[PDB]
């Protein structure tokens, strides 16, 4: 099948209930051995006498694509309208999935993941309180610049780096529809790895874990407008949608709450919620 050729599906419905009659025999479909590592492929008709039901149900929304391909917020960043002197006049984000709780748990249900991605970004502005907040501020244009691992970081809201002679950038004016890009499978390895039980150094040391593999570069944000008399603050929300997805090695979903965006740390939680008695209604 070709995950990039969207308009090319496969309709697979759920299994029908075949009619069962009474039995008295040596065959035992519901007596087995869990030790084997095998899951019982029993159907209700092996235990009861069932009728004939035609299941036209399809496992549609549980497809890896339909599950992951809904655009989620991964991070938001903030920056004011200012001069070279103002540190806060621009900002940046090192790209990472592990910053938020919700998409992270979804992706982490799979060890290895290969996908293309749709990035949408909602940049929002607000007037700072000031004697000058009265001010005719013109429409603000914004610049989002991707700096891949190795290129020049912008040190100020106003330096050569923002030229983008080779880095990808998006210039976006306010009031318009949210900015949107598609990204290929950017990794150096044959699949993205949500987990790495290993080290950054051959000597079993340095950085432990997934961090080591997931070097994605960073997004730099600024206003293109010169500052109005009163400051205006903008905050950019970066949205991710995994499209054209393939997934390998399913994992148990995260039980414990996330602590660090850097590492897989947790503090131990109970297996489930407690109940009144082992016999419950």
């Amino acid at each position: 099948g070709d995950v990039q050729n969207a308009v090319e599906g496969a309709m697979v419905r759920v299994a029908d209930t075949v009619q069962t009659s009474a039995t008295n025999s040596e065959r035992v479909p519901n007596l087995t051995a869990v030790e084997t590592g095998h899951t019982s492929q029993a159907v209700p008709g092996d235990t009861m006498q069932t009728r004939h039901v035609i299941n036209n149900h399809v496992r549609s929304e549980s497809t890896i694509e339909n599950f992951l391909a809904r655009s989620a917020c991964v991070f938001y960043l903030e920056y004011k309208t200012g001069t070279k002197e103002d540190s806060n006049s621009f900002n940046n984000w090192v790209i990472t999935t592990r910053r938020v709780a919700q998409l992270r748990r979804k992706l982490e249900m799979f060890t290895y993941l290969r996908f293309d991605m749709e990035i949408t970004v909602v940049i929002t502005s607000s007037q700072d309180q000031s004697t000058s907040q009265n001010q005719n501020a013109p429409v603000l244009t914004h610049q989002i610049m991707y700096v891949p691992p190795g290129g020049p970081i912008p040190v100020s809201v106003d330096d050569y780096s923002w030229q983008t002679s080779t880095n990808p950038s998006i210039f976006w004016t306010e009031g318009n529809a949210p900015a949107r890009m598609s990204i290929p499978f950017i990794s150096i390895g044959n699949a993205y790895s949500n987990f790495y039980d290993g080290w950054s150094h051959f000597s079993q040391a340095g950085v432990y874990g997934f961090t080591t593999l997931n070097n994605m570069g960073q997004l730099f944000f600024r206003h293109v407008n010169k500052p109005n008399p009163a400051a205006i603050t903008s905050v950019a929300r970066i949205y991710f949608k995994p499209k054209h997805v393939r997934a390998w090695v399913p994992r148990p979903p995260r039980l414990c709450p996330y602590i660090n965006s850097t590492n897989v740390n947790f503090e131990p939680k109970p297996v489930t919620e407690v109940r009144t008695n082992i016999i419950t209604t």
């Binding site: 030790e35 084997t36 044959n190 039980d197 051959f202 090695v249 947790f266 131990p268």
Partner: protein, 254 residues
């Protein structure tokens, strides 16, 4: 003839027998095989030591006790000292292999108890001290079993080994999604998992990357009664399969 409870596995100059097995799990449906010309990237000729590497290495066996919480081993690292596999892993930047994992544990009709035997790919474990980072010596003792803890705390940069969260922030009862078997003392005396090379890249460094972790966790505690043999060990023997190595230089660590 042929009772399906009886099994004989031979690999290199090694045969393991069992007279109470419960089938054998081939990891994710795939039997191990060599890296193909399409999937390759390292351009140099691989060395494939076959029988010299691909044979049954018995690691240091652990004792199962009534209250003992559990054990883990890390591969390929557990084998870093096992004969010529270890040497090849020591002299090569890159290595690749699948494995026949055979866990052994015998007791008696009168004993009871049940252990989960599971091969978890990329089991990246959490630091006990959530604030800090973990470190190698608390992640792996090579061929010696690292133990799971019933206690929710540990020494500086030790892993959070609290059993019910499997050392990695999840429900231990869901570990079953990974290639696994169970040695339930009523039913069987051994487990066998044939694990393929599961990774996001064709070959990798044998030291840096612990490709998967073998976890043996007792879900039903070991028990027996009035004077009926106390000592009952669990022995893990493992054989590398389709092992090949690229990038040769000097003895390696740093």
């Amino acid at each position: 003839g042929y009772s399906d409870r009886v099994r004989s596995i031979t690999l290199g100059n090694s045969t393991i027998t069992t007279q109470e097995c419960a089938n054998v799990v081939v990891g994710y449906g795939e039997w191990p095989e060599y890296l193909s010309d399409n999937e390759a990237t390292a351009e140099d000729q691989p060395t494939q030591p076959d029988v010299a590497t691909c044979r049954f290495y018995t690691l240091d066996s652990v004792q199962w006790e009534n209250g003992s919480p559990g054990w883990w081993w890390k591969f390929p690292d557990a084998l870093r000292d096992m004969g010529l596999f270890g040497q090849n892993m020591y002299y090569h930047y890159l290595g690749r292999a699948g494995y026949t994992i055979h866990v052994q544990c015998n007791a008696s009709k009168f004993h009871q108890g049940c252990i989960l035997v599971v091969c978890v790919p990329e089991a990246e474990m959490g630091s006990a001290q959530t604030s800090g980072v973990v470190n190698y010596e608390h992640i792996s003792k090579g061929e010696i079993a690292s133990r799971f803890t019933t206690t929710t705390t540990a020494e500086d940069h030790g892993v959070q080994a609290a059993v019910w969260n499997a050392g990695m922030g999840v429900g231990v009862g869901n570990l079953t999604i990974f290639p696994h078997q169970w040695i339930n003392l009523r039913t069987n005396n051994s487990a066998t998992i044939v694990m393929p090379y599961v990774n996001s890249v064709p070959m990798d460094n044998m030291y840096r990357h612990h490709n998967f972790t073998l976890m043996i966790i007792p879900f039903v505690p070991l028990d027996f009664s009035a004077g009926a043999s106390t000592y009952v060990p669990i022995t893990v023997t493992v054989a590398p399969m389709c092992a090949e190595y690229n990038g040769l230089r000097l003895a390696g660590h740093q």
